[PDB]
Structure formats: C-alpha cells, structure tokens
C-alpha cells in the first residue's frame, strides 16, 4: 500500500543507481508476482521521496516473452521530471532475463494485459563508478591453486549466506587458520552494502595485497559484486527488506574440481571490517 524507499551509501555522491519493485497485476486487482525493474545510474540531486512518488505515477506495461530463456519486457513510460536523468531506460522498452528480475514469471499471463504497480525504490548513492571483476576472470580455475572466497552472512528483516570469489593464490605447506588470518588481515578489507541488481556487496582494499591477486582484481581497490549474479533466488528476499551484513568469513578452497577430493576448505571466521 504505502510506497517506500531505501538508500545505501557504500564505502560528493552526485550519481544514483535506481532499482524499483512492483506487483505484476492484471490490468482488467489479482496480483500475479513481484518484479524488479533495474534503471541504472543517473546524475541527480533529487530526494528519494520525489523519485519514488514520480515512479509510482508511471504506467509500466509488463510482457512475458522467450529467447534462449524466459524474458520480461518492461514497456516505455513517462512523462518525466525528476526521472529525466533515467529517460534513456524509462522511455524505451527494457528486456531482462526473468530469472533475475522475477520469482514467478510462470504466473504472468499471456492472454491478458499485465502492468507493474511500483511499491518500493532502492537507491545506491555513488561517486561515479562501480567496478566488477569480469565474468571470465571469476570463472578461471587452475591446478595447484587456492581460491580466495568470502562467505557473507546477511541478517534480513532470517539469516542467510552467499559466497563470492576474489581470485586465486598458488599453493605451496600446511595452511593453518592463523597463518591465513594474518595475511588476510593485512589486506584490510572493508565491506558495505548497496542495491546494484537488488543487493550488492562493495569491498574496499585498505591495506596490502600481493601483485598476483591485485592483477586478478584489475588493479582495483574498490570492487562490487551483485547478489543478482551470485544467487538470484536469495536476491529476491532482499528487494524490499532491510539488510545488514552480520558476519564475513574467508573460505580458502581448491580451484579445480579434482582437487576438491584432495584438499579440504580453510575457514577463517570474522575477516575484514563491516562498515556500519
């Protein structure tokens, strides 16, 4: 009923990333499912309430289609005033993979018209931009390597976890929890939340990092990971619910599948610093 917003400031924040959520309903109100409509970045100094109220006035059509996977096409909308920085997305058709932006696309009807009734807006205040490690770099696996993964635990208003990959180290040696904790502590990792793709985890490397790992991170000290890519099912649970990082552990694992039969995981609990 009452539309709401949430703002995140991970890390002169002139840029704002927007993602809104709405009920997909029969225009004819039978609710079919909830869907996310990512709008991307725009330079804006408008207050969230003004952006939220203008988004709620828009008429956005929802059409279900297929390619290699199920897709959702959000129809063009307008007119705009505070949302003019996002006019490229809002005034044209936008197509997304249904798995990422909807939990029950199987319930959206084809024989009757469907519309999105926006009820929530999530905002990430940015310095813009966000850097993400390329998908091909994240998928690289090698023999005799230790994948440096992080296990993030979220408290949602329910405790849940998601895992992300930072890079690999070459394996030598008994990797104790104490030795690894010392090396990871020297990196001075800082974690914070955003809403890029629903929920995003932002990492700032504030300490020392080896040249090998830094090269795998594109020589970037600020990294962003979207829960939409890590786990799109858990991502749905964070959309219009307040989230907080409760704990972060580092999990050092083998890199190739055959080495999972040989080497067990090294679990280093409570790594880094959560920026409140």
Q: Which residues in this chain contact a second copy in the complex, by CB under 8 A?
A: 61, 63-70, 73, 75-76, 92-95, 98-99, 103-107, 110-111, 135, 138-139, 141, 147, 149, 151, 160-165, 229-234, 249, 251, 253, 256-261, 265, 267, 269
Count CB-CB contacts under 10 A for residue 94.
19
Torsion of CA 206, 276, 229, 128, to 10 degrees: -60
Please report how close the Cβ of residue 50 comes to a second copy at its closest, in angstroms: 26
Please report how close the Cβ of residue 234 comes to a second copy at its closest, in angstroms: 5
Please report how close the Cβ of residue 44 comes to a second copy at its closest, in angstroms: 24
Q: Which residues pair with 65 in a beta bridge?
A: 71
Please report how close the Cβ of residue 64 comes to a second copy at its closest, in angstroms: 7
- For a second copy, the closer of residues 5 and 96 by Cβ is 96
- For a second copy, the closer of residues 46 and 149 by Cβ is 149
38 Cβ contact list (under 8 Å, min separation 6): 18, 19, 96, 101, 197
70 Cβ contact list (under 8 Å, min separation 6): 64, 97, 98, 99, 105
- For a second copy, the closer of residues 82 and 165 by Cβ is 165
Which are the residues after which the chain is interrupted (C to N > 2.5 Å)? 11, 28, 128, 157, 172
Please report how close the Cβ of residue 31 comes to a second copy at its closest, in angstroms: 16
**C-alpha separations of 258 from 44, 147, 165, 250, 265 in Å:** 50, 14, 18, 21, 14
- For a second copy, the closer of residues 50 and 265 by Cβ is 265
- For a second copy, the closer of residues 161 and 220 by Cβ is 161
- For a second copy, the closer of residues 172 and 257 by Cβ is 257
Please report how close the Cβ of residue 253 comes to a second copy at its closest, in angstroms: 5
């Amino acid at each position: 009923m009452i539309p709401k917003y949430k703002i995140y400031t991970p890390g002169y924040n002139n840029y704002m990333y927007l993602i809104c959520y709405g009920f997909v309903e029969d225009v004819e109100k039978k609710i079919r499912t909830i869907a996310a409509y990512p709008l991307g970045v725009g330079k804006s100094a408008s207050h969230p309430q003004d952006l939220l109220e203008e988004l709620c006035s828009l008429k956005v059509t929802v059409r279900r289609t297929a390619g290699s996977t199920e897709k959702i096409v959000f129809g063009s909308s307008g007119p705009l005033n505070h949302l003019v920085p996002w006019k490229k997305v809002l005034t044209s058709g936008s197509i997304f993979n249904a798995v990422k932006v909807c939990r029950n696309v199987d319930q959206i009807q084809l024989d009757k018209h469907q519309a999105l009734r926006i009820f929530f807006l999530s905002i990430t205040k940015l310095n813009d931009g966000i850097y993400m490690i390329p998908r091909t770099m994240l998928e690289f696996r090698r023999n005799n390597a230790i994948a440096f993964n992080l296990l993030v635990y979220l408290k949602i208003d329910k405790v849940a976890s998601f895992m992300l990959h930072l890079g690999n180290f070459v394996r030598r040696k008994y990797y104790s929890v104490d030795y690894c904790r010392r090396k990871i502590d020297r990196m001075k990792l800082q974690f914070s939340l955003g809403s890029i793709g629903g929920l995003s985890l932002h990492i700032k490397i504030n300490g020392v990092i080896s040249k090998r790992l830094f090269a795998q991170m594109g020589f970037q000290k600020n990294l962003c990971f979207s829960l939409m890519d890590i786990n799109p099912w858990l991502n749905r649970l964070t959309w219009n619910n307040s989230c907080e990082i409760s704990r972060v552990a580092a999990v050092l694992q083998p890199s190739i599948p055959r080495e999972f039969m040989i080497y067990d995981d090294v679990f280093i609990d409570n790594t880094g610093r959560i920026l409140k």
